Amino acid sequence: VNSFSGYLKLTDNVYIKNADIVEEAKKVKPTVVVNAANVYLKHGGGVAGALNKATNNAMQVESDDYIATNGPLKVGGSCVLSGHNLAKHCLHVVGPNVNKGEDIQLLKSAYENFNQHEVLLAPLLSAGIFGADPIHSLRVCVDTVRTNVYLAVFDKNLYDKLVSSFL
């Protein structure tokens, strides 16, 4: 039993809710919140901008030190950093950005990072400003993640469509 509430169960291991991931993180304090990161960990907008703002920019400060030491992530890759006031840990995962021309097949590689964590609160990778089709992102998620994932979808209209079209 865990503290996630109000989610629709899609499969054995994938759950979905119309929620603001920032508000959900602050209420649940999950072990892991996933950030929709870019390779530079520049958390300017979308989910990343919102998570970073909720940490009062502490996420960005930590991220800048990470990059200065380690260099950029790979598209499809991830790193574990602090969750600050939102979670124990933040798993920064880089899905492909269609608006940069990145290969969509890398979306499966991006979701494979979730399998290193038993339970996660997450957004749909490569959705929103990353330009992929969220219905496709949900399909890849369900077909790739085997650990327990709680998906937060900010837009109610999109949430209803994802549910209504889910096979």
Ligand X SMILES: O=S1(=O)CCC[C@@H](Nc2ncnc3[nH]ccc23)C1
Residue ranges in contact with ligand X by CB under 6 A: 20-22, 36, 46-47, 50, 123-124, 127-130, 152, 154
**How far apart (Å, rounded) are the C-alpha atoms in residues 159 and 48?**
19
**How many other C-beta atoms lie within 10 A of the C-beta of residue 152?**
25
Instruction: Kindly tell me which of 65 and 160 has the beta carbon lying closer to ligand X.
Output: 160
Instruction: Kindly tell me which of 81 and 127 has the beta carbon lying closer to ligand X.
Output: 127
Alpha carbon distances (Å) from 13 to 24, 81, 101, 148, 164 = 19, 24, 31, 5, 19
Instruction: Kindly tell me which of 27 and 65 has the beta carbon lying closer to ligand X.
Output: 27
Instruction: Kindly tell me which of 104 and 129 has the beta carbon lying closer to ligand X.
Output: 129
**How far apart (Å, rounded) are the C-alpha atoms in residues 57 and 49?**
9
Distance, CA of 146 to chain centre: 15
Shortest distance in whole angstroms from residue 146 CB to ligand X:
22
Shortest distance in whole angstroms from residue 130 CB to ligand X:
5
Instruction: Kindly tell me which of 45 and 72 has the beta carbon lying closer to ligand X.
Output: 45
Shortest distance in whole angstroms from residue 165 CB to ligand X:
17
Go through the chain and tell me how many residues it has.
167
Shortest distance in whole angstroms from residue 11 CB to ligand X:
20
- 35, β-bridge pairs: 92
Shortest distance in whole angstroms from residue 124 CB to ligand X:
6
Residue nearest to ligand X (CB): 128
Pairing of strands 78-82, 89-93: antiparallel
**How far apart (Å, rounded) are the C-alpha atoms in residues 57 and 62?**
9
